């Protein structure tokens, strides 16, 4: 059982998720894909995009969105006081990298 | 809280419109509790409200093209979109003679 | 506009005073009928043409 | 490069003239023909001269992977992998 507070980084292949999507929807829809992509592998809701990852998706505008992204994913544990069940959340942040080829996915041992 | 009042005065004090006024997102408790012009210029002085520089419109790409085009480079036959008389009126040439 | 006769200015001065709501105590008069002011007004509808 | 959307045919197969209804991947049944078969067209011995293995992605101009490596030969990613030696 992998612990709480695990930080791993991975490539999302965005070009396949956005294929044939209406241009005016590319950037805003690419974010819902990353929250849904990260969300299901970390198995949390409330996935949070840093400015570093937001601006990377938008820097070419709404139409052109980069075909791939490396993201660093830090889950942490925070619950409000009187909740019955634990509440996690993740911080998805960009990791600028020149190439992509060869990188795969690996957990940062922190 | 709504800083809509302070941002209305800091824009009228700085002589800038919005897109140039900067309210410090950290100190937002201290920007509110400025209810008056005398109290806002105390924020402009203390660095919690700044006027940002104009966005850059650079004329240089046009300075390079001007020099090239002063050697005669880009005015050809295919780059002329208007009548000769409109580019150089034959009347202005004969007044010059 | 900026222009106005003074005679016309006052007619709007009176009509601005008359828009106030019915005082709270005046509901408590013994044998009272008036509840909310029925003559109230808003410039968006029913325009005085003075 | 395989049959598009299908992959390599590992097991024994029937090869059958003409289109068959249904897309790739779907189960079908071949049944012994009911219509009476006496005719030149329907009684014949089929002898195939050639079978086209060229890629169905794009225009395949090569029949085998060897025919391709002859038209190219040494190549930048190949000049590299020998340096692993």
């Amino acid at each position: 059982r992998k612990p709480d507070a695990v930080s791993m980084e991975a490539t999302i292949h965005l070009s396949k998720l956005l294929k044939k999507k209406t241009f005016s929807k590319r950037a805003p829809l690419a974010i819902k894909r990353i929250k849904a992509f990260v969300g299901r592998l970390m198995k949390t809701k409330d996935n949070r995009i840093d400015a570093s990852l937001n601006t990377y998706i938008w820097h070419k505008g709404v139409k052109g969105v980069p075909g791939r992204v490396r993201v660093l994913i830090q889950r942490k544990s925070e619950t409000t006081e009187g909740n019955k069940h634990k509440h996690f959340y993740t911080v998805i942040s960009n990791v600028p990298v020149a190439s992509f080829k060869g990188l795969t996915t690996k957990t940062v041992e922190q | 809280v709504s800083l809509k009042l302070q941002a209305r005065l800091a824009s009228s004090i700085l002589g800038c419109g919005r897109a140039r006024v900067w309210l410090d997102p950290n100190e937002a408790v201290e920007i509110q509790n400025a209810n008056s012009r005398k109290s806002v210029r105390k924020l402009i002085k203390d660095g919690f409200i700044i006027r940002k520089p104009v966005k850059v419109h650079s004329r240089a790409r046009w300075r390079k093209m001007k020099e090239a085009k002063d050697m005669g480079r880009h005015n050809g036959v295919g780059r002329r979109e208007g009548s000769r008389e409109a580019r150089m009126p034959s009347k202005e040439l004969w007044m010059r003679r | 506009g900026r222009f106005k006769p003074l005679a016309v200015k006052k007619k709007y001065a009176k009509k601005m005073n008359q828009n106030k709501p019915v005082p709270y105590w005046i509901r408590l008069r013994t044998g009272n009928r008036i509840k909310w002011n029925e003559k109230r007004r808003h410039w968006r509808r029913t325009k005085l043409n003075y | 490069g395989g049959f598009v959307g299908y992959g390599t045919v590992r097991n024994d197969y029937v090869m059958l003239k003409g289109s068959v209804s249904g897309p790739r991947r779907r189960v079908m049944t071949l049944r012994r023909p009911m219509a009476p078969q006496t005719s030149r067209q329907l009684k014949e011995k089929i002898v195939l001269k050639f079978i086209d293995t060229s890629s169905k992605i794009g225009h395949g101009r090569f029949q085998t992977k060897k025919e391709k490596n002859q038209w190219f030969g040494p190549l930048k990613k190949d000049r590299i992998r020998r340096e692993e030696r």
Partner: protein, 122 residues
């Protein structure tokens, strides 16, 4: 512009000549040199930087002496018979600080009519 220009004459552009005498600029490095963030090395590199990268007519790295570059004391001076803009030496300094990546730290600002002063940020 009277004689029309040529490309290919962009090598060796004439610069206006100061007919009265010498002009002298200063770059005051005292403050950061004191704290060790500069060293005798970087001051040897800072003078050399201007020695290599100042461009006299069209070209850089070759300064005959119409301009002299002196490290006397801790303050750099540039004495010039040519007409330069002082703005231009504020330019080269910033361009030096960004190779050393000192530029988030050391800022330059004009203390006197002929001089700049390296300092620190609040």
């Amino acid at each position: 512009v009277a004689v029309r220009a040529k490309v290919g004459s962009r090598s060796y552009v004439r610069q206006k000549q100061l007919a009265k005498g010498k002009k002298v600029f200063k770059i005051d490095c005292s403050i950061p040199a004191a704290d060790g963030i500069f060293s005798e090395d970087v001051l040897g590199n800072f003078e050399q930087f201007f020695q290599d990268n100042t461009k006299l007519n069209g070209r850089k790295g070759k300064l005959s002496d119409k301009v002299r570059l002196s490290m006397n004391d801790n303050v750099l001076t540039i004495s010039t018979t040519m007409a330069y803009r002082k703005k231009y030496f504020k330019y080269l300094t910033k361009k030096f600080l960004k190779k050393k990546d000192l530029r988030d730290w050391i800022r330059i600002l004009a203390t006197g009519k002929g001089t700049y002063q390296l300092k620190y940020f609040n």
